[PDB]
C-alpha cells in the first residue's frame, strides 16, 4: 500500500460514515461470488449459489459479508497499522482457510464498484483513488503472513 494524505484519509472516513456496513458487506460478498464464480469454492456449505438471485439472497452469504466488512471497517481506524491489525487474520486465512490472497484483491475491486454504485457522483475520481490505496493496503496486510 501507498501514501494516504490526511486529505485522502479524511475523504475515506467521511464516506465510510455513510455506509450501512451490513448491507454493503452482503452486496460486496454476493457480487464477488457472482462476478468471479471461482470464489464460490470456499462456500459450498452455504447452500444454494445456483444463480445471481440465489447468491444475492442467500442468508449465509449475507452473514459472511457482514463479518468480513465489519473487520474491514475496524481496520479503517488503524490505517497507520494495517499489518499489525490484520496479522492474526492473515495467519488464519493462510494456515487454516487456505484462501489464495488473490481473492482479497478481487474483493477490494468489487468493493470499489459497490461504493461507486451506492454513492454515485459523490464517489469522485480522488475519492476512488484514496479507496484504491486502502483496499490494496488491506489486501497486502492480509497476505503478509502467507508462507
Amino acid at each position: 500500500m501507498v501514501h494516504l494524505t490526511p486529505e485522502e484519509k479524511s475523504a475515506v472516513t467521511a464516506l465510510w460514515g455513510k455506509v450501512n456496513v451490513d448491507e454493503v458487506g452482503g452486496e460486496a460478498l454476493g457480487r464477488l461470488l457472482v462476478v468471479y464464480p471461482w470464489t464460490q469454492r470456499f462456500f459450498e456449505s452455504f447452500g444454494d449459489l445456483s444463480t445471481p438471485d440465489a447468491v444475492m439472497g442467500n442468508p449465509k452469504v449475507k452473514a459472511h459479508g457482514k463479518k468480513v466488512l465489519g473487520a474491514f471497517s475496524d481496520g479503517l481506524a488503524h490505517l497507520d497499522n494495517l499489518k499489525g491489525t490484520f496479522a492474526t487474520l492473515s495467519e488464519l486465512h493462510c494456515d487454516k482457510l487456505h484462501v489464495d490472497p488473490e481473492n482479497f484483491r478481487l474483493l477490494g475491486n468489487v468493493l470499489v464498484c459497490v461504493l461507486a454504485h451506492h454513492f454515485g457522483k459523490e464517489f469522485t475520481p480522488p475519492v476512488q483513488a484514496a479507496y484504491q490505496k486502502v483496499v490494496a493496503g488491506v489486501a497486502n496486510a492480509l497476505a503478509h503472513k502467507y508462507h
Binding site: 454476493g30 457480487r31 457472482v34 462476478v35 445471481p52 447468491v55 444475492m56 475491486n109 470499489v112 464498484c113 459497490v114 461507486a116 454504485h117 454513492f119 454515485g120 457522483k121 464517489f123 475520481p125 480522488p126 476512488q128 483513488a129 484504491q132
Partner: protein, 141 residues
C-alpha cells in the same frame, strides 16, 4: 466466451449510456490516471489536467471503439482489427494496463447507472471488457 445473456446485458447497459459514452470514456481515463499513476507513463505527450481537450477527445475515441464492439459483439476480432494492429505494433501498451482501464470503466458505469448496474449486468460487463482487452492484445506476439 460471451453468452447470449451476456450480449443482451451489455447492449442494454450500453444503450442506456447512449450519448454520454464520450464523457464517460473521459471520466474513466481520469479515474485511471489518479488511481493507477503508472498508466500515465503512456501519456507523457498529453496535458493530463482535469478536463483537458486531449483527455476529452481520447475518452470519446475510446467510447466510440466500445460502441463499435457492442454493435459487433458476435464479430469483435474483425470489428477491432485496426485497433488491435495499432496497439500491438505502434502503442505497445503492456497488457496489464487493460485490466486497470476496464476496472475504471466499470466504476464509471456503476456511478452513473444506478438502476442498471445489477450483479448480473456487472458480471456481463466485466466479461465484455475482458473480451475487448483480449482482442486488443491478440496480435502482440
Amino acid at each position: 466466451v460471451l453468452s447470449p445473456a451476456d450480449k443482451t446485458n451489455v447492449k442494454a447497459a450500453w444503450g442506456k449510456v447512449g450519448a454520454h459514452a464520450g464523457e464517460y470514456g473521459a471520466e474513466a481515463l481520469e479515474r485511471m490516471f489518479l488511481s493507477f499513476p503508472t498508466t500515465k507513463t503512456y501519456f507523457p505527450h498529453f496535458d493530463l489536467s482535469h478536463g483537458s481537450a486531449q483527455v476529452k477527445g481520447h475518452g470519446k475515441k475510446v467510447a466510440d471503439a466500445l460502441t463499435n464492439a457492442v454493435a459487433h459483439v458476435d464479430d469483435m476480432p474483425n470489428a477491432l482489427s485496426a485497433l488491435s494492429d495499432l496497439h500491438a505494433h505502434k502503442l505497445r501498451v503492456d497488457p496489464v494496463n487493460f485490466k486497470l482501464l476496464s476496472h475504471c470503466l466499470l466504476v464509471t458505469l456503476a456511478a452513473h447507472l444506478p438502476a442498471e448496474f445489477t450483479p448480473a449486468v456487472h458480471a456481463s460487463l466485466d466479461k465484455f471488457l475482458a473480451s475487448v482487452s483480449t482482442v486488443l492484445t491478440s496480435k502482440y506476439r
